[PDB]
Design a protein around this ligand. Sequence first.
Ligand code: CLF
Ligand SMILES: [Mg+2]
Ligand SMILES: [Mg+2]
Lengths: 112, 473, 464
Amino acid sequence: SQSHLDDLFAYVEERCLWQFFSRTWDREENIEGVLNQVGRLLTGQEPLRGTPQERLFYADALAMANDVRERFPWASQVNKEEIEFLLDGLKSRLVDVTITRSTNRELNHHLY
Amino acid sequence: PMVLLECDKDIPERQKHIYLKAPNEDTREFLPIANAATIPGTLSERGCAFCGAKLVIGGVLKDTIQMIHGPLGCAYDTWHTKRYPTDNGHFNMKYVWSTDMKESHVVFGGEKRLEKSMHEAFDEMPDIKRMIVYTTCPTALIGDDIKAVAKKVMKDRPDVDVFTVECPGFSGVSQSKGHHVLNIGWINEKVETMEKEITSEYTMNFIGDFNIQGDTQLLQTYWDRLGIQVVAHFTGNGTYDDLRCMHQAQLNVVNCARSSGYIANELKKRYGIPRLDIDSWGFNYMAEGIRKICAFFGIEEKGEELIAEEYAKWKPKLDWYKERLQGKKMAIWTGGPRLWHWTKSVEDDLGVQVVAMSSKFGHEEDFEKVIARGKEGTYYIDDGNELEFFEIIDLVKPDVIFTGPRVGELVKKLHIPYVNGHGYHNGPYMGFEGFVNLARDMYNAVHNPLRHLAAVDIRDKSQTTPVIVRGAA
Amino acid sequence: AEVKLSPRDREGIINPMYDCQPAGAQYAGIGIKDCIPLVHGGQGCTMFVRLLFAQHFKENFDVASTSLHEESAVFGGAKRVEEGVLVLARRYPNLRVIPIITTCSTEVIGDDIEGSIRVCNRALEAEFPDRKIYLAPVHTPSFKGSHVTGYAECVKSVFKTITDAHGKGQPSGKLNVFPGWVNPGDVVLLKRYFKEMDVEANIYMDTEDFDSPMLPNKSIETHGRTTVEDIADSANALATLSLARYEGNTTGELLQKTFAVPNALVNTPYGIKNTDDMLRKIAEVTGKEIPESLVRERGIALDALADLAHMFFANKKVAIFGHPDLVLGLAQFCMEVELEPVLLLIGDDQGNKYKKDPRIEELKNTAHFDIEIVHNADLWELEKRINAGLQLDLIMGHSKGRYVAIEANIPMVRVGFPTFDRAGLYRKPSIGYQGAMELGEMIANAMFAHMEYTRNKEWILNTW
Ligand code: CLF
Ligand SMILES: [Mg+2]
Ligand SMILES: [Mg+2]
């Protein structure tokens, strides 16, 4: 599972922008929202498309799910539980690097 | 590691602003300090907060008087310097307005001078009914209350609408403060003060694109094809009143997250409009962007038809340039965002290796992005200065530098060609066709007989004058 | 016929003709070798001017900022000046001169520039014992005057500073020459005239090398050539020749008062008569004869202009804008070639001086058509008059007026500063005999292209 997680993390760091929103609370929301939809899409579940925010998380997650399936043959071989575990690991890594340990001094500024 | 350049031995705080990315490093321990005070006397590239409000954002609008409350220099200095065309004959670039502050106004106040100037502006151009008023260094220092003047003028002239910005040049540390003050004032005062007809089931604002050489008009051809109504462009080829309608959109698409992320964030907070960040430079990036937009709207098939046609049209040319540009080394010395929009896109789509990057005013968030996307062995510089630029050139030996024209004219003496990273050479540079335009200018810049000629010293009997072979896509 | 002076009737400005004082001070300073001006104010006051010079010259020029930020606006900015001087000196070991140029911000807050200079002189003396850096206080509030006034002020302050340090020495035998704000090509021409007349002269500032080569060795040669030693030797000159009343004459007057170098102010040498009168003055002060080569260059100019004047220029109405010495000089040149300069625009608050300029009288006694001279003018004053029905055949002015001419469909010759929208103009003289010929030719060629584009008797360009 470590090499697979390393693959996902390297993908998100070089490609995605949603983890780099302006404030901590937005990064947290996006890491959770997008990666939950990625898990759905990678395991054949119906995505959530109710609210405008769910629809946006689906749009971000569809790019990543499609990219992950193209780039990484393992992503079509592992089972649903393994996908879920990886994405939970990926959430925790992204929080770590984009929030906990980021020295970006603006992240907690109450006003935009 | 963090780098102490030789030229910075006497200003060694600059080490905390310069990152050389090395293998195995945890980049979280090497994020440059950004958006901090400038060191005096350095020949930093930075501008002023007024610039970020008036020149960058407000002045893009096609139908608005840009009233600069201050002495005439601030106005002269922001006139004939930008390349943001309109569809109405470029009114924005033809005119600039000043209150012509004199010593007596410093002494006694400038509010009546401002009020007079505002009525004169509206009298001289009776078809124009919109205005932005900016403060500058001295009008801020003397405390003229431009919001109260504006209120009086709107009471006296009920057919006009006036917005005000407090952005003297000494506020903040750079252009960035101007972006912030304008964005938050606009959302606080003017959004949801008008509505427009909705003509589509799919509506968006495009936030953070300033129509450089027609970028916004080019992207607009995509949205028209897709059947998406753009309520407001913030601010490329835009109008004052469109901006008052931003709350109507279903989706905010953001390119310049630096200048314009503020208003996207507030629109989300206040109105629930989701923020989607894209890259509207870069060929494969543009495709991802379109696919995200279309997935949000549920028009995925329409997006795939547009993408297919654009790749059939432009991809062969792009690939012809990749073949010739692959392995070339580039530097990007611009404001900030274009660093992270371009580093990987030129690598993916053109095979170009970005070896050094410098941001005049970017924040730590911009450095997070660019370091995430950027290469090992590359220099990442916050608030670079002229001497640093020379030392970096000696370290990395770029084949081409994307930067402003004055620095381009400087590095020309070193026989290094430039592309104008700000106002472009032959743009637009956004979108599918735009990235081919960018590639063409990079190719012509590098594969240029004059560079080779300049190296030859005709006095050297051992040297001949070469002949070089170019191509075209 | 009347030559009328009138002010702009509006309080505000639309489309300013000039930049502010600090921009002119910067221009003065970049003509000095081993000089980096330090502009004490916000960052835009430096960066926008460095851009303006890149627009005009297509070159980089080094100018630094003190980077005034919010703390300094509340408590004063002196520490920013003092840091900036030291950071310059530490990082540029060959730096010799720093004009410390104030701006609107630092004038309003009252920072004590001369006090900061004392601090910096002590610090520099201690840290760099074998170096001398000349710090010149340049007071340039932007809320009076313009870049014309600022240029004049900077030249004067620099001259005061450097001559205060060195004083009077042995007679040099040389002329001091202040051409004012002119192009590298104008400097090239004057050097040639002095060489042909066997007159030794320092031209202040010597900006010929602003048009710098791209060299095999990658060296950067884009510098002013006027050195400290050249400025200091001003005190020892035979005489000063001041070509521009508003752009350097006050420094010739300072050198007269301080060192008894006699100053001769002449009309700026646009056109034939003004050039003739310049050369007569040189001959008078130096005792050297005007050479045959200059009689021949004059005659070549005359011959070229005679191919143009009555055929294409006569009775054509011209508007001219730009620096005051340029506008008044070009109006005289126009009349020599049968053009009619009916509207002259001068862009700053020095109207009380302009009403006394002897060239206004010279116009009043020569013109046969009414002339309006608008002082404190902006470029909206030109546009508005065209829109109200003023019929013009030609505009002469700088590139920031371009859209007026484009939209009105009037041919325009680019003169003065900045001329960014055409290539190479900085290398072409406008003053002197060669300059008159080149101006005349630019006018004609602009007219000729206009005739072609508009199909206005374009068949006539065959046997003129
Ligand atoms: S940092 Fe920016 S550009 Fe500078 S003054 Fe300040 S708002 Fe303006 Fe204005 S008039 Fe001239 S250019 Fe300056 S000295 Fe004043
Ligand atoms: Mg990586
Ligand atoms: Mg002849």
